[PDB]
């Protein structure tokens, strides 16, 4: 009876351990879909910049707390995109958007990985709360009995 409660406690203990090792996966998945959303917006701004007809467009450059400076974008046709490791290359708007969409697909796959490990972990919890809910059921019957 105390050997049957140590097996029913080992499943309910691995539950908080496998559901904690799945708390980290939900954390990293919140980072990825955010970085990807940022990349999509830097791409969004580029595709729209390609559409603004204006020669050298006037802009407000944000410098902090409700503060802006008055400027103009001088090379509307190109963009410096970070290549990584302390380097960034100047590209045409298209080459830039294209490279961004390639990094946007790198994020797209990291999301899948983390979303699939978060899947099998919700599987190992479903089958653990299933093995233990069945260990609790056969425990209330070994005890139960129709009276007199």
């Amino acid at each position: 009876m105390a050997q049957n409660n140590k097996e029913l406690e080992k499943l309910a203990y691995e539950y908080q351990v496998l559901q904690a090792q799945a708390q980290i996966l939900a954390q990293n998945l919140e980072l990825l879909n955010l970085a990807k959303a940022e990349v999509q917006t830097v791409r969004e701004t580029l595709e729209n910049l390609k559409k603004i007809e204006e020669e050298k467009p006037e802009i407000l450059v944000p410098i902090g707390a409700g503060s802006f400076l008055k400027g103009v974008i001088v090379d509307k046709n190109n963009a410096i995109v970070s290549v990584g490791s302390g380097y960034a290359v100047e590209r045409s708007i298209d080459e830039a958007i294209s490279f961004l969409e390639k990094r946007l697909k790198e994020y797209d796959e990291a999301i899948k990985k983390t979303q699939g490990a978060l899947a099998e972990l919700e599987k190992r919890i479903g089958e653990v709360a299933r093995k233990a809910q069945e260990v609790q059921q056969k425990q209330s019957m070994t005890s139960f009995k129709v009276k007199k």
Binding site: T41, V42, L49, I52, E54, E58, I59, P62, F68
Partner: protein
């Protein structure tokens, strides 16, 4: 597992309510914006927020783009509206088929 379908239809109903709020607000906001900008001279100095850039635009292009935003935005509003009373018909269906059983 008719409850594995009600837990499902309940999370559905949620993200729709969530998007309907961001939509009905993003729309009511655009409506006010167009309302105000239309009352402007044509030579008005306006800056449009293109993603990360704040570029200067025109009264005409600003009202043009603003109408499209309104149109398409209102379209999705009805979309979420139907999707809502539909997921609710499905919720009220399982709550009745589960509550009777």
């Amino acid at each position: 597992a008719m409850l594995g379908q009600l837990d499902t239809y309940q999370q559905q109903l949620q993200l729709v309510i969530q998007q309907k709020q961001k939509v009905q607000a993003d729309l009511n906001e655009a409506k006010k914006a167009l309302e105000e900008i239309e009352t402007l001279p044509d030579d008005a100095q306006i800056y449009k927020t293109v993603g990360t850039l704040i570029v200067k635009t025109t009264k005409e292009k600003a009202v043009q783009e603003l109408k499209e935003k309104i149109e398409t935005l209102e379209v999705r509003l009805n979309a979420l509206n139907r999707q809502e009373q539909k997921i609710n018909e499905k919720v009220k269906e399982l709550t009745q088929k589960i509550q009777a059983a």
